[PDB]
Amino acid sequence: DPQLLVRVRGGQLRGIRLKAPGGPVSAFLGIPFAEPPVGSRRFMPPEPKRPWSGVLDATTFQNVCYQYVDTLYPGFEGTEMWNPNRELSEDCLYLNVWTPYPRPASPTPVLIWIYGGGFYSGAASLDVYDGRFLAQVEGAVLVSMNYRVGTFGFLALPGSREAPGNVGLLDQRLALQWVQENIAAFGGDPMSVTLFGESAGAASVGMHILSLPSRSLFHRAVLQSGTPNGPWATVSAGEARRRATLLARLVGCNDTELIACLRTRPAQDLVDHEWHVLPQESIFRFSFVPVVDGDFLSDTPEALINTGDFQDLQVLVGVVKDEGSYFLVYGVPGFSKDNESLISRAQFLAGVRIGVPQASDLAAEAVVLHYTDWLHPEDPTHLRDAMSAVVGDHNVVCPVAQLAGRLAAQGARVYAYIFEHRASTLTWPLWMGVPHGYEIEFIFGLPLDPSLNYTTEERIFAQRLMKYWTNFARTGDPNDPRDSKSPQWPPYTTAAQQYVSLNLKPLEVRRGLRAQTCAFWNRFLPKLLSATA
């Protein structure tokens, strides 16, 4: 089948014809885009894949980058759907491509997915990242890469030659170059490339916006539930050096000698200890993440968004209704997926220190005082829902509002949303609402698969979202360019702050993304922590 045979710069590939509910798609899975980052290449920037002979089999997903595997609720669908679904290996630098079948006759907009997982986990092979739906229904070319996570991708001894940090983002960048060089062979348009990602994937997309060498490799960006700015996505050079030095201590190890010993260590030994280097007991905080190196990131993301020129940029950003709930069951006492998680006031104060682990006593009190309902100060249902809002606002919603506003003020075309539909098939309890990560299956169009037991209105809703996202990819505007009839999705601006709700009902335009509450986080808290240092 000639539709499954493709020649790229490195040699020949054989893909596989897949069935999507509406017809066939061409899938080329497991394409190597870098030399395996193994042995002495551990912690090093990726190198381009050497050319191969014959026809490389690209009909199956490749290994998942070595990472921690979650065991909190063993074999529960809601946690397992994020766990690695292929073998673990440091040899994991591969990407995946879906195209229409037959291959598009005209050059077609490319979407490039970057998974999240807190920079410590994730894989492009998960079912919720299946590209066949967007390829089949919308005729998109869709690309996803694996990139190194945890210590392997982000352990940094800033200034060292052998662990300069940010190599996981360098993996992404290399995959982006690969798309520039090769996507035309699959019928993709390299002059129309849209990055999209969720949570740490969104933050990664954010870093690419903020890092010059990346800018020639894409045109538009979508950030779902994550930003390069904010309290979890980056660390200073000093804090990264501390964490890497501590980890080295934990496993038996000048910079060169230290990294050399680290390179001798079996992968599982590093994973065993990575989560022991956080300075405070926390949630929504991750041990090894992008570092302000003065290189990939020339300054902090805050500094860079405050001063950048984004005039040529189109960005779509958004959150889910209950960003915080998912994280509560992992670190905060009194929370569980198996009960209503009705907490006491005491447990609420305790939960705030954990959710805002960097806060002084006074800042922590300010948070408690802000989120307490003084009509019902001791009510367990309020306290529980408040706890979730604290985590979600502090980590996602307010950083997103900060980004949207800063980008809009500096020339970017910005569109913002909030996603409010809870999947009928969701396995988490009601009180968690619409948790972090559960818009993705809709954007990727999973409900269009009849065997997945989604409702029919959900199928219809999924098609709307794929339309918005791909319209955005095509044109930088999510609005259907020839469907009339209200309501249109207006651009987010600093003046009017318009965003839309994504749910089963038609678009509703709202103004202000938790404006009062995010003013507390974005404007007041920094002045506070500053003074109370």
Next chain:
Amino acid sequence: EGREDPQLLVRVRGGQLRGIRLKAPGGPVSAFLGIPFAEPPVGSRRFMPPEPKRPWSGVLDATTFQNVCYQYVDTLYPGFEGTEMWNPNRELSEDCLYLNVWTPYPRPASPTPVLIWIYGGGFYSGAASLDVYDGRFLAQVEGAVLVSMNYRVGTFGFLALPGSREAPGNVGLLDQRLALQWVQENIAAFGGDPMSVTLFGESAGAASVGMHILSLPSRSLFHRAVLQSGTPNGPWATVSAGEARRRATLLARLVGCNDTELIACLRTRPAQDLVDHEWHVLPQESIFRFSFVPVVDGDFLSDTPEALINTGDFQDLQVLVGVVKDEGSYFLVYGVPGFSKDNESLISRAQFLAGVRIGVPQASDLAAEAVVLHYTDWLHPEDPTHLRDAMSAVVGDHNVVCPVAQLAGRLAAQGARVYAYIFEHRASTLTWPLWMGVPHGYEIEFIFGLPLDPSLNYTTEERIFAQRLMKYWTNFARTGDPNDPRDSKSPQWPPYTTAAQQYVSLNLKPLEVRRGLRAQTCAFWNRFLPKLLSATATEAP
């Protein structure tokens, strides 16, 4: 004595009085005006605790109001009724310790519950003789016995060199206490029940009422209390001993003056010299701050009102407290640039930040930033209309609404039966612009039942409404409960409690129960702000 009206002659402890028969809309009332209750606090007695009035001979004429206590007179809007209604309507004198009594005509058969009014005016102004404090309507329509007293204001009432013998502070409060004692001894001669005495006051008068609650020797002189738009706790009603000393000393300097020598020199100064300089000793440019106010002396006030209301036992006490809808607006047009009674007062963001520093004069920079961040509308951070209204709310919340919430909460948690209200009707006769809403002091005329006087041009609805307010107040004085026992159908006013936090709206519509007295914002002022001020050293004070 011989041909006069036999119903207007009464004897009190100090001698015989002749009162006057006044006309009220529904019938005659008895008034006894300008009854001395102290020796005149003049000469060597300036700044001193009041001494009880020595008995007189013959029949003291009690048919006209007496002198108003020496005070600063506001002149910002000359001839404008909005300011004039508050100005002195009798001669200014240090010889001003007199009180007034209104009773049914003829006097009541059986002992009648007594109401004692204490006027406001920032502890630097006021008089019991103003038209808005006319007791004739309450006396006539409700059968009430009403008493109001002049007390010393400004320096004469509140200048203190704490610890000294010659100027111990709080003598204005002691004037009020002496009048309360006078009521205990003498009110039965008018048909008043000394065993049923309810204090009420507005603004500084309310704070005064609160101080009698907190001061042991006052407690045996009354049984129930009403606090309208004012509290003894909060940022303006008291000053520390150190601050009172510093202000007394500065004022002394400004007029050309060991505490004995200083005070003695002050006693040689003309009353007007003192008044002309009193306002000049405030530590910052402010509004809703007053130069000479009750001092935490360790005597009348054994501790700060905040400490006292936190630890006090208040079981045998019933209290009615409340606020008007727009406590702050009145104060803006006096002291905050951008504000006026003559335009819409739409202000800039700059003018708003400047207004916050003036309205929260004790705030550190961060505290102020917190206030600004909390009151800013972040969807419209520079809208002149929201800014105007937020400035009003800042001043109202910080000074009245939140101190009131803190009071009702603490009293209720500690055994007092509390009733709370918000007053939301704007008089059709109001001369202030619409943007000011229902300003500080403008419920008073309804409580006293002025709309019952046809010649004042209130609406028929306003007359019925005033009648309603009068029932509430006198029912509360009568029984500790504003609800009418003989009225089941009509909506009930529930007690305020820490758990439910219920209060009622007072307007032209029937009572409506609401929950939470600006609960969210008052958490900022009452819980967070003081912790935030704690983090700052240099300076203020």
